[PDB]
Design a protein around this ligand. Structure first.
Ligand SMILES: *[C@@H]1O[C@H](CO)[C@@H](O[C@H]2O[C@H](CO)[C@@H](O)[C@H](O)[C@H]2NC(C)=O)[C@H](O)[C@H]1NC(C)=O
Lengths: 82, 46, 147, 643, 981
């Protein structure tokens, strides 16, 4: 579903990992809003495992609604199908 | 009037307008009437 | 160019061998018929020739036939009993105009020219020769009479 | 910080009312500013100027309708190609070198028939509209250009209502056959031009009528091996030819513009016409084996120029008929993008709305579409996303996608391909693309989109566009904006306050009549802070249903499927307001065709459906310049703004 | 096949690609070497032509037709490029009108009669934008409707079959019967009932057609109305058609003009002039001698009347189109009308506005200035035949015409510059003359072959100096002024001594156009004033003939197209020198040489004589026009009083109906009015004309009919053998015959072309040419096909004439039916055949009561009654003429015929029971006759038609039964004359 992307040389401070102005602890999987991901960092090698919302492929009779309010997974494009 | 080299030119607007030779000559632009630009020749009048 | 022409005169050759119509342009006879015109009306038989002379009188286009007999420079035209002896005294170099002289107690001079039209200089020489021969007598213009 | 934004159409138009907009922010006191167009480069002469009043009641926005009078410009050798737009105020003052063009207005030559025979009169009338799309009332000049290229006529006729009917042109009795050319043009100071074509072909009385009707107008994947051609031949309207010898010649063609053709002397087949109808089959594959073309993959976009010669038996007569071209189509579908900016906002769902078309440009549905995505990050570490599948809705032909990307993405090389139920892999339609990221010196971006995609917004409705900012400093954004271009004129402006408790905001836009048939909506705000403010802009393209202000409607009374010759019938014309109506009635046989809205759209200086590389480029694509104490860049390069 | 693809491959991209293609065309009649003699496209094209031709001709032996047609396909598609032409003709779009709509406007109209599917397109232009409204269609059609194909004309006597077809559009068949409105003049198979032929109800299958035929036989002349009533179960449609009936024989048009000068400014007062009524010799029986009259006010009256109407083109109608000079005779009359009205300011001649008429004139003048743009090449030269090579003659002529019009319609100064430079840079030798690029022979000049070269170079130099001196005020460069100095020097040095008056007059003119003070030009104009002719003393008329004096002395009796060219050139040489004392007779001649309509004999004398007439009418003061011209027959009533004034000064024509002499007269007034009468007779034979061509024409039958018409020039005295000038081969087609246009195209289209143009208009076939050879013939072969069946076919003509000398002509009759003699018509279906002929009484009938002879003799309607004896029978393939001598005279109402004199009888060949045997005696009585002037006396011709009584009268007495017959004959003969009941 939701792919992942790993960044290198992330700003790690006081054991906490701040990335794109989002402070996340070392062994903490926190849901975020800006950007809308589910992230986890590691100050040992300064890398951040982060996953996106799954890309939506809209089939018949469906449509997509997305509002940036709230954190993952509510900030994800939802495959709303009546 | 051995060297004035009149020519068919576009206007500052887009109408094809043959430039004018000095006061005592006349411009004759050989070749087809649509080839623009094209360097013409100046002939006398008398 | 000079215009002493067609010497000697031959009343046949001076008539274009009877194939072309002639009109009367000048005459010292004050009885000159109006629009008088005599064309060959037949073939040349033994020294004779038919000539249907059409002329005008008032409004009538009369047509009186004649008979022309030729001997050198002289001619005798006769219709019924009336007789006239004409002699071609001068004839243009190309037979376009000739001046006729009718014989009587006072000789009158007539001048004929092709109907189809004659060369302009030869007609001028015919007129000069006539005016010389007429010697100041008053001339009519039979073709200037509403033809 | 105190900011100001001036927005003027990218190209000032000589003789047009070039509306300028001024929007200032931060200033709280009422004040006056005089926007002015000034000469180049010394600012010596004021071609025009305007006064605006900026107050709290006016929301510190106002528009100054400036106008470069046509006669106020030099002539001869050097008419100005640049003017200075200039603003004055007790606070600020800015100037920018703006281009000007004389191409103002439109001329549509309308010849009654597109094909004339010798000694017929060419009825030609010209419509003259200015850039405001109103009757121009200017003196026009035609110029009938013979096929060889030498003007054979020039006739001026003053306008009074916008419809300039000209004295008819008599085609000589021995004309010069070919494709003549008419060139309407304005007589004074305007470079506006209009052009129409009409062929003059010699009438040749035919022994009989030969008609060709192919199976389909396109040779797809199936009929590439067999192609049924129906060749009918008939005498004068329902006298069926008895028996004839039908000689057919086939040749591959490149383009319908140049009449070049390459024959195939391997399949010059002939048959026997029997009782009016003879049908043959053309095996395209074995026939093209001359140079062999090596596959169906070649010959794409080419035409099959069919030549038929019917020589009947009885009278020894001969007649010829042709098909100019039968386009080869490699795939029964065509893909294109609708309502998708080819520019990526890092951190925003990138919606891809692919649209499937047949070869007749009709929106087919139910066609599954697959889409893969190759991305290029700032570290150049290309990442591949999983293939997603969307099937086209049968309502509008749009198969929606949503392709979320990581933050570090710059160039998305996404590729859409049709996945039909019955087509092999080769016969599927595929289209690749390349979406670049919004380049911003800060981390500020904007993304706007309206309600839905499958209705083609209709005039009279209201537009609920949802503007969504995404940035740090988001809780300091004070005012939004919106400029609504149309035909190159800024017909709107305003400001909507941002609710500092919500992330996005629903902007309500009243759709008016000026916005028909296509308008752009530019929206932006001001990120401020340390030593600099920043404009962050994102534009969209609103396609509105082509509706008139004065909807014209003609009826024939009485209405029936057939009339009789000489019958007296009435034509009933009904409009919306008092409006002139030109008329014409031509034989429908000449058409085997007047499309103005495509020619009437060359006034929209924009390009593409929105987005842009950076801020200034989002403007310069929508056809706006801008003056701002904040970031300003992207000079003209007036040659080819966008295609 | 393989020897076709080698050609199609070798010459795909070559420069001369049309050459060998039109050398590969099929021509079963001439060798590839004989055709190569006609190429003028250089040694490359001749070589490609010869090679491609021999390799195409060698193949066509022992070949199946499929391969031949596939080869013609290969050729016609591979070698050429394309062809602009359409197979359908599209009606004129109507409703082209702009209508202000006050929010609603209903307008009504009438759909045109055609069967189309109209499309109405409203484009509303309002202050809110353009609105291409929805197109509302309108499909007009009739579901069942009859349509006929009536021939253009019909030579009277011939039995036409008016083919037709009833078209049905409904899928379900129906009943229908067609019936023709039998007009009394149109003899049909059936007879009227109350007036329609019987109609039998026939059935046509649905969604198809059905042939319909009708056999008529016209017997009267003039447009006859003919209806066709399609009587069906759903209506009765009456389709009016007009069947034009033309008299037999050829048409001959002979004019006669008179200038009425009641005040005498022409040096001769002329108030009364008599137009005699001369019945020509060979005339078609039962035919009137039509003779229109036309009296026009001004000197330029005829030109004005032609232009100021919808005719505007009557200056050429006897000559064919196609060359560029035709599209210049289209704009010479309008230009000269314009130049007269303008440089005189006679605009008030109209009661209308002087602005609308000026605008219409300028419109016609411009629409004319463009018809020649089609004949201009890439290098701004003009070419005579569209597509032919560039010609020095016609470039100079087009320059003259365009440099004259530049006064009122500003011409493109750069195009005239380019044309003048093309002339004076390529086509001017070192001596000064001009040479012709093409091989167009515009005129045939006399003399030996070197002297003809001299004369032709002189004519071309002078003609081009005229063209340049007229178009030189547009583009007054110095290059061409030096060219004109050189050419005028050539003329001055090489005109005298002359070799023909024509080139002397054109040289005097072209030299007067420039510097009129060169002592040599005085000598030229003097030696031209000397060649003059005159009629009268002081001259009433003055003209010049086409030949010198020292070469020919005979003065012509009629006007020839070189006489008017030379007269107009000398008149213009005089007017250029302001000799108004000297041109008053020349103008009189030229104004009588005019022809009703405006023009003159050819296209050159027309332009020059119109220029003379106009440059004169503008140069001498206008005299007030006020006359009361009273035209009236001699022994009849007044025809039509003409009240001449500037109010009405263009009195329309008046068909002179009655067959008496005509007399025009006027009262004392002021003006100068010219009275033209136009005699239009229909001659039966053409041996009585001097014809200058050898003609033979056949209708050969083809196996896999075909007219084979040839011609040849007969060079007159002191001429060369180079053939004719531009000639015009006019091949009239018999009724119901139609030429196969593809053969004519194959003759004209190729680069081996024989005929430089063609056109099939109204049943004629008018081919043109650059020359017809004097050494040997020149044969045109084109297939013909019977378009419908016609019986009793009357021969149609085949005329060839020169184009700039329409008197150098020859006519020949020919029929496409060798159908055998017409001894009898064999019974039924004949009541129309003999409807209007004479019927001989049965040989030696005794049932005659001898009282019918009494009553028929004393009828006032019967004119002549006497017995003759046929001496010889002679046929002119249209009628037969019976030479007979008058034996015994019995009655004569009109003028009498002398005893034992020769009288000629005439009857139609297609008349059966009226045969006459040579030498046998017959008694003849019939209607009136004709008096013909046989150049020395009267002669009488008598037609043998209906109501002409004829009986056989044997001379012997060994009949044993006709003793009482001859008894009644002789007693009636002795009693007819002394009483006259
Ligand atoms: C052929 O048909 C026409 C009508 O189409 C007949 O018409 C003429 O006389 C009629 C009176 O009987 C009128 O009603 C028509 O208007 C008139 N038509 C014209 C053109 O003048 C005509 O008589 C018929 N032909 C014959 C010989 O009778």
């Amino acid at each position: 579903r939701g792919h992942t992307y790993v960044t290198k040389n992330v700003t790690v401070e006081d054991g906490a990992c701040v990335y794109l102005r989002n402070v996340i602890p070392n062994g903490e999987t926190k849901a975020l809003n800006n950007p809308c991901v589910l992230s986890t960092c590691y100050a040992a090698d300064r890398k951040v495992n982060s996953t996106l919302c799954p890309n939506i492929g809209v089939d018949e009779g469906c449509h997509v609604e997305w509002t940036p309010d709230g954190v993952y997974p509510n900030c994800c494009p939802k495959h709303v199908c009546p | 009037c051995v060297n004035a080299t009149c020519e068919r030119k576009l206007d500052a607007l887009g109408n094809a307008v043959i430039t004018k030779c000095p006061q005592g000559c006349l411009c004759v632009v050989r070749g087809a009437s649509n080839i623009v630009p094209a360097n013409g020749t100046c002939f006398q009048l008398a | 160019s000079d215009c002493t022409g067609s010497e000697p005169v031959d009343a046949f050759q001076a008539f274009s061998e009877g194939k072309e119509a002639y009109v009367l342009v000048r005459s010292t006879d004050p009885k000159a018929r109006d629009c008088l015109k005599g064309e060959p009306a037949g073939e040349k038989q033994d020294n004779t020739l038919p000539v249907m002379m059409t002329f005008k009188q008032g409004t009538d286009w009369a047509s009186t036939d004649w008979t022309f007999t030729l001997d050198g420079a002289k001619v005798t035209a006769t219709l019924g009993q009336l007789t006239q002896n004409r002699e071609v005294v001068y004839d243009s170099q190309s037979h376009h105009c000739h001046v006729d002289k009718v014989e009587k107690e006072v000789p009158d001079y007539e001048m004929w020219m092709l109907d189809a039209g004659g060369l302009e200089v030869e007609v001028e020489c015919c007129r000069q020769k006539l005016e010389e021969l007429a010697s100041g007598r008053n001339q009519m213009y039979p073709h200037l009479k509403d033809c | 910080e105190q900011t100001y934004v001036i927005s003027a159409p990218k190209i000032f138009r000589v003789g047009a009312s070039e509306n300028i907009v001024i929007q200032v922010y931060g200033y709280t006191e009422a004040f006056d500013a005089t926007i002015s167009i000034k000469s180049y480069p010394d600012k010596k002469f004021s071609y025009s100027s305007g006064h605006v009043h900026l107050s709290s009641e006016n929301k510190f926005q106002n528009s100054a309708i400036l106008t470069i009078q046509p006669k106020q410009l030099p002539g001869g050798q050097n008419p100005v190609s640049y003017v200075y737009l200039e603003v004055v105020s007790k606070h600020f003052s800015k100037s920018k070198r703006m281009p000007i063009t004389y191409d103002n207005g439109f001329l549509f030559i309308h010849t009654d028939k597109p094909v004339y025979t010798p000694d017929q009169s060419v009825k030609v009338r010209v419509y003259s509209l200015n850039d405001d799309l109103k009757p121009a009332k200017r003196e026009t000049v035609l110029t009938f250009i013979d096929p060889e290229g030498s003007e054979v006529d020039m006739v001026e006729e003053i306008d009074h209502i916008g419809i300039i009917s000209f004295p008819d042109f008599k085609i000589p009795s021995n004309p010069r056959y070919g494709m003549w050319t008419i060139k309407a043009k304005y007589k004074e100071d305007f470079s506006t031009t209009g052009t129409a074509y009409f062929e003059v072909k010699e009438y040749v009385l035919p022994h009989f009528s030969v008609s060709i009707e192919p199976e389909y107008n396109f040779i797809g994947y199936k009929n590439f091996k067999n192609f049924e051609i129906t060749i009918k031949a008939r005498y004068f309207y329902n006298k069926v030819v008895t028996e004839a010898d039908v000689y057919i010649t086939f040749g591959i063609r490149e383009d319908l513009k140049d009449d070049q053709k390459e024959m195939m002397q391997t399949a010059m087949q002939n048959t026997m016409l029997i009782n009016g109808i003879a049908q043959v089959t053309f095996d395209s594959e074995t026939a093209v084996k001359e140079l062999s073309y090596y596959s169906l993959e070649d010959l794409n976009n080419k035409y099959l120029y069919i030549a038929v010669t019917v020589i009947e038996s009885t009278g020894g007569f001969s007649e010829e008929a042709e098909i100019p071209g039968i386009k080869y189509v490699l795939s029964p579908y065509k893909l294109n993008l609708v309502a998708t900016p080819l520019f990526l906002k890092p951190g925003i769902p990138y919606p891809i709305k692919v649209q499937v078309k047949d070869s007749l440009d009709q929106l087919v549905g139910g066609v599954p579409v697959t889409l893969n995505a190759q991305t290029i990050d700032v570290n150049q570490e290309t990442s591949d996303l999983d293939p997603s599948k969307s099937v086209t809705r049968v309502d509008d032909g749009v198969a929606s996608f949503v392709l979320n990307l990581p933050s570090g993405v710059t160039v998305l090389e996404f590729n859409v391909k049709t996945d039909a139920p019955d087509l092999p892999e080769e016969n599927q339609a595929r289209e690749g693309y390349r979406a670049i990221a919004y380049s911003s010196l800060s981390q500020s971006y904007l993304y706007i989109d309206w309600t839905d995609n499958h209705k083609a917004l209709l005039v009279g409705e209201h537009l609920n566009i949802i503007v969504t900012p995404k940035s740090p400093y988001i809780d300091k954004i004070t005012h939004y904006n919106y400029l609504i271009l149309s035909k190159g004129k800024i017909i709107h402006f305003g400001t909507r306050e941002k609710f500092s408790d919500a992330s996005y905001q629903s902007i309500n836009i009243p759709v008016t009549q000026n916005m028909v048939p296509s308008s752009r909506l530019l929206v932006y705000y001001i990120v401020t802070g340390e030593q600099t403010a920043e404009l962050v802009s994102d534009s969209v393209w609103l396609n509105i249903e082509e509706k008139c202000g004065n909807q014209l409607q003609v009826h024939l009374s009485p209405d029936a499927d057939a009339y009789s010759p000489g019958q007296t019938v009435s034509l009933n014309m009904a409009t919306g307001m008092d409006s002139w109506v030109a008329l014409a009635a031509v034989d429908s046989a000449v058409y085997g065709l007047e499309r103005v809205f495509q020619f009437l759209e060359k006034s929209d200086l924009g390009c593409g459906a929105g987005g842009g590389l950076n801020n200034a480029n989002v403007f310069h694509l929508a056809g706006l310049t801008f003056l701002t104490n904040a970031n300003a860049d992207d000079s003209q390069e007036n040659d080819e703004p966008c295609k | 096949q393989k020897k076709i693809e080698e050609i199609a491959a070798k010459y795909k991209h070559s420069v001369v690609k049309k050459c060998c293609y039109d050398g590969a065309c099929v021509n079963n009649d001439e060798t590839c070497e004989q055709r190569a003699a006609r190429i003028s496209l250089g040694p490359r094209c001749i070589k490609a032509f010869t090679e491609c031709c021999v390799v195409a001709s060698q193949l066509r032996a022992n070949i199946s037709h499929k391969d031949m047609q596939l080869g013609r396909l290969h050729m016609k598609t591979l070698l050429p490029v394309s062809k602009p032409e359409i197979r359908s003709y599209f009606p004129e779009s109507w409703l082209w009108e702009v209508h202000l709509v006050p929010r609603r406007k209903q307008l009504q109209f009438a759909l045109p009669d055609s069967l189309t599917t109209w499309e109405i397109q409203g484009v509303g232009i309002s202050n809110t934008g353009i609105c291409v409204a929805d197109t509302v269609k309108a499909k007009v059609f009739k579901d069942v409707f009859l349509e006929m194909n009536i021939p253009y004309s019909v030579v009277r006597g011939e039995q036409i079959q008016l083919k037709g077809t009833v078209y049905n559009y409904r899928t379900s068949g129906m009943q229908f019967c067609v019936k023709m409105s039998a007009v009394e003049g149109i003899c049909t198979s059936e007879s009227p009932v109350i007036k329609s032929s019987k109609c039998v109800r026939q059935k046509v299958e649905g969604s198809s057609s059905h042939l319909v035929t009708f056999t008529v036989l016209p017997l009267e002349i003039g447009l006859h109305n003919i209806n066709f009533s399609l009587e069906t179960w759903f209506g009765k449609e009456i389709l009016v058609k007009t069947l034009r009936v033309v008299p037999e024989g050829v048409k001959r048009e002979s004019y006669s003009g008179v200038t009425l000068d009641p005040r005498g400014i022409y040096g001769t007062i002329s108030r009364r002039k008599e137009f005699p009524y001369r019945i020509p010799l060979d005339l078609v029986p039962k035919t009137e001698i039509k003779r229109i009259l036309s009296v026009k006010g001004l000197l330029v009256g005829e030109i004005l009347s032609a232009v100021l109407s919808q005719e505007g083109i009557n200056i050429l109608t006897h000559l064919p189109k196609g060359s560029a000079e035709a599209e210049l005779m289209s704009v010479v009359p309008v230009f000269y009308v314009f130049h007269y009205l303008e440089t005189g300011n006679h605009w008030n001649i109209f009661h209308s506005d002087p602005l609308i008429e000026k605008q219409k004139l300028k419109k016609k003048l411009k629409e004319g200035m463009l018809s020649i743009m089609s004949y201009r090449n890439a290098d701004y030269s003009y070419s005579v035949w569209k597509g032919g090579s560039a010609s020095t003659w016609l470039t100079a002529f087009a320059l003259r015409v365009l440099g004259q019009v530049n006064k009122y319609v500003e011409q493109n100064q750069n195009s005239i510059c380019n044309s003048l430079l093309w002339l004076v840079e390529n086509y001017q030798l070192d001596n000064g003359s001009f040479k012709e690029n093409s091989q167009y022979q515009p005129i045939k000049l006399q003399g030996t072959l070197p002297v003809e070269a001299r004369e032709n170079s002189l004519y071309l130099t002078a003609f081009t100096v005229i063209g340049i001196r007229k178009a030189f005020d547009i583009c007054p460069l110095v290059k061409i002024d030096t060219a004109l100095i050189k050419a005028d020097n050539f003329l001055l040095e090489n005109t005298l001594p002359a070799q023909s008056t024509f080139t002397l007059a054109i040289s005097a003119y072209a030299l007067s156009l420039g510097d009129k003070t060169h002592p040599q030009f005085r000598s030229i104009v003097s030696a031209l004033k000397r060649e003059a002719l005159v009629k009268g003393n002081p001259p009433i008329y003055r003209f010049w003939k086409d030949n010198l004096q020292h070469k020919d002395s005979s003065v012509p009796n009629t006007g020839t197209a070189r006489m008017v060219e030379t007269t107009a050139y000398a008149l213009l040489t005089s007017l250029n020198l302001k000799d108004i004392n000297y041109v008053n007779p020349v103008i009189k001649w030229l104004s009588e040489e005019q022809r009703y309509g405006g023009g003159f004999y050819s296209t050159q004398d027309t332009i020059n004589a119109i220029e003379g007439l106009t440059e004169y009418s503008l140069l001498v003061k206008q005299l007030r026009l006020s006359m009361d011209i009273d035209v009236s027959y001699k022994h009849k009533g007044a025809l039509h009083n003409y009240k001449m004034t500037d109010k009405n000064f263009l009195g329309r024509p008046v068909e002179v109906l009655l067959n008496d002499d005509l007399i025009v007269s006027t009262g004392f007034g002021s003006g100068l009015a010219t009275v033209h009468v136009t005699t239009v007779v229909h001659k039966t034979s053409t041996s009585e004309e001097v014809c200058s061509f050898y003609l033979k024409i056949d209708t050969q039958d083809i196996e896999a009919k075909r007219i084979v018409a040839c011609a040849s020039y007969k060079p007159s005295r002191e001429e060369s053998s180079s053939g004719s000038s531009h000639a015009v081969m006019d091949i009239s087609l018999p009724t119901g015959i139609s030429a196969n246009e593809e053969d004519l195209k194959a003759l004209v289209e190729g680069v081996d072309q024989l005929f430089t143009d063609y056109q099939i208009k109204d049943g004629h076939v008018i081919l043109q040419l650059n020359s017809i050879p004097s050494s040997d013939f020149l044969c045109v072969r084109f297939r013909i096909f019977e378009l419908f069946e016609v019986g009793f076919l009357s021969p149609a003509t085949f005329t060839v004439y020169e184009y700039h000398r329409p008197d150098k002509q020859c006519t020949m009759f020919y029929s496409t039916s060798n159908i055998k003699i017409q001894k009898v018509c064999e019974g039924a279906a004949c009541k129309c055949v003999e409807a209007d002929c004479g019927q001989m009484q049965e040989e030696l009938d005794l049932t005659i009561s001898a009282e019918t002879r009494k009553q028929t003799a004393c009828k006032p309607e019967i004119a002549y009654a006497y017995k003759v004896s046929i001496t010889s029978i002679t046929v002119e393939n249209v009628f037969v003429k019976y030479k007979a001598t008058l034996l015994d005279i019995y009655k004569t109402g009109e003028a009498v015929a002398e005893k034992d004199s020769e009288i000629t009888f005439i009857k139609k060949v297609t008349c059966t029971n009226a045969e006459l045997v040579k030498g046998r005696q017959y008694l003849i009585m019939g209607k009136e006759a004709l008096q013909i002037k046989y150049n020395f006396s009267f002669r009488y011709i008598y037609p043998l038609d209906s109501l002409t009584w004829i009986e056989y009268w044997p001379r012997d007495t060994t009949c044993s039964s006709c003793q009482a017959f001859l008894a009644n004959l002789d007693e009636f003969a002795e009693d007819i004359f002394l009483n006259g009941c």
